[PDB]
Ligand binder design. Structure first.
Ligand SMILES: CCn1c(-c2cc(N3CCN(C4CC4)CC3)cnc2[C@H](C)OC)c2c3cc(ccc31)-c1csc(n1)C[C@H](NC(=O)[C@H]1[C@@H]3COC[C@@H]31)C(=O)N1CCC[C@H](N1)C(=O)OCC(C)(C)C2
Ligand SMILES: Nc1nc2c(ncn2[C@@H]2O[C@H](COP(=O)(O)OP(=O)(O)NP(=O)(O)O)[C@@H](O)[C@H]2O)c(=O)[nH]1
Ligand SMILES: [Mg+2]
Lengths: 164, 170
């Protein structure tokens, strides 16, 4: 019974659409639980209101810094950082949801959604979910990105939570 | 108009390439870590009485992308080769950057400055004489810097321009 969560995406405050994710709790339960709880806001903090700060067309959309809103922060429900749970799952193609990090065992809240296969990240970033519905919303986000990832409009998680 | 100099800042992840560049350009320092994809900056300066424009490429130290440096090494005119004085591995990583640069330029005579950054920290593992000896063996200047205190920041970039001038004025 893998949980499902959603992001309602907005672009400079204007609704874009909903992306939903399957979280692979069957393979990466600690990492899935972190993302699930951050999506509900149940710890009193989480993804709601935060932005996708790095969008690189052809590669990925990255977000999740809800503490500094500048791409350097974020925190997990276990502490500022937690360990790499496992590297069972690979970056196989568009839609893969994986943890950002600053080196081994530095998972926080930042995550990325692939828009292509990124196999050179295998074994270094923990894959823990995939887009279930609304992949075309992630595709629509790419036109607000750039070569180095700086975005040209504010792409926000206007709302988020867990689905039944 | 003033001469433009294409400077490229290289070195291992976390040595302070970006902090040095942002201190030079924007006069501030933060201890947050924002690992670089690729950034470019411009600043005009006066060096030895002559005004010029620094075009600075701040490169990624992210080690998995070492095969993606050829284009910026071809375009760059001089290289700030940065290590951190409290990180011996980053000092060892210098040699490979210089080897790459020498291969792209087909030259032992490439404008380059060796920068030992984070000299404000008490946890030093690379001594000054060790870095001075390496720079001498490369035939290039060595400067110790702190992006946090601004020690040596202007000097390191200005010295690299002086090296480019010496290479393009013979
Ligand atoms: C060399 C240029 N270049 C490229 C790249 C590479 C390629 N290829 C490589 C693969 N080749 C195939 C084998 C043939 C084709 C050519 C093409 N063009 C590019 C870009 C567009 O050229 C400018 C990249 C890339 C990535 C980095 C640095 C430079 C990079 C980099 C820096 S930091 C990081 N990576 C991990 C980062 N860490 C943090 O953000 C920490 C912040 C602080 O603590 C929490 C938070 C993180 O977790 N992610 C989540 C995962 C995706 C990742 N960001 C990211 O953005 O990757 C960008 C990109 C484009 C996927 C890769
Ligand atoms: N004490 C001190 N800390 C420094 C100094 N320069 C950089 N730092 C710190 O070291 C960390 C990494 O700095 P940064 O400039 O991002 O390094 P980088 O070489 O650009 N890393 P990357 O290759 O990933 O882009 C940051 O936390 C920064 O504040 C310095 O001179 N002194
Ligand atoms: Mg940097």
């Amino acid at each position: 019974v893998n949980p499902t969560v959603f992001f309602d995406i907005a672009v400079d405050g204007e609704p874009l659409g909903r992306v939903s994710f399957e979280l692979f709790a069957d393979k990466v339960p600690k990492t899935a639980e972190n993302f699930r709880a951050l999506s509900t806001g149940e710890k009193g903090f989480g993804y709601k209101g935060s932005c996708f700060h790095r969008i690189i067309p052809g590669f990925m959309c990255q977000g999740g810094d809800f503490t500094r809103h500048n791409g350097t922060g974020g925190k997990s429900i276990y502490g500022e950082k937690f360990e790499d749970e496992n590297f069972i799952l690979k970056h196989t193609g568009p839609g893969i949801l994986s943890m950002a990090n600053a080196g081994p065992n530095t998972n926080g809240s930042q995550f990325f959604i692939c828009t292509a296969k990124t196999e050179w990240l295998d074994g270094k970033h923990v894959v823990f979910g995939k887009v279930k519905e609304g992949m075309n919303i992630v595709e629509a986000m790419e036109r607000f990105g750039s070569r180095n990832g700086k975005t040209s409009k504010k792409i926000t998680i206007a709302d988020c939570g867990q689905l039944e | 108009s003033m001469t433009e100099y294409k400077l490229v800042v290289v070195g291992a992840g976390g040595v302070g390439k970006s902090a040095l560049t942002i201190q030079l350009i924007q006069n501030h320092f933060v201890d947050e870590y924002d690992p670089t994809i690729e950034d470019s900056y411009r600043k005009q300066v006066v060096i030895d009485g002559e005004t010029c424009l620094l075009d600075i490429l701040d490169t990624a130290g992210q080690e998995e992308y070492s095969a993606m440096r050829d284009q910026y090494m071809r375009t760059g005119e001089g290289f700030l080769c940065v290590f951190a004085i409290n990180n011996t591995k980053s000092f060892e990583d210098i040699h490979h950057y210089r080897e790459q640069i020498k291969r792209v330029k087909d030259s032992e005579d490439v404008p380059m400055v060796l920068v030992g950054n984070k000299c404000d920290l008490p946890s030093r593992t690379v001594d000054t004489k060790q870095a001075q000896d390496l720079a001498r063996s490369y035939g290039i200047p060595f400067i110790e810097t702190s992006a946090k205190t601004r020690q040596g920041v202007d000097d390191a970039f200005y010295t690299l321009v002086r090296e480019i001038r010496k290479h393009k004025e013979k």
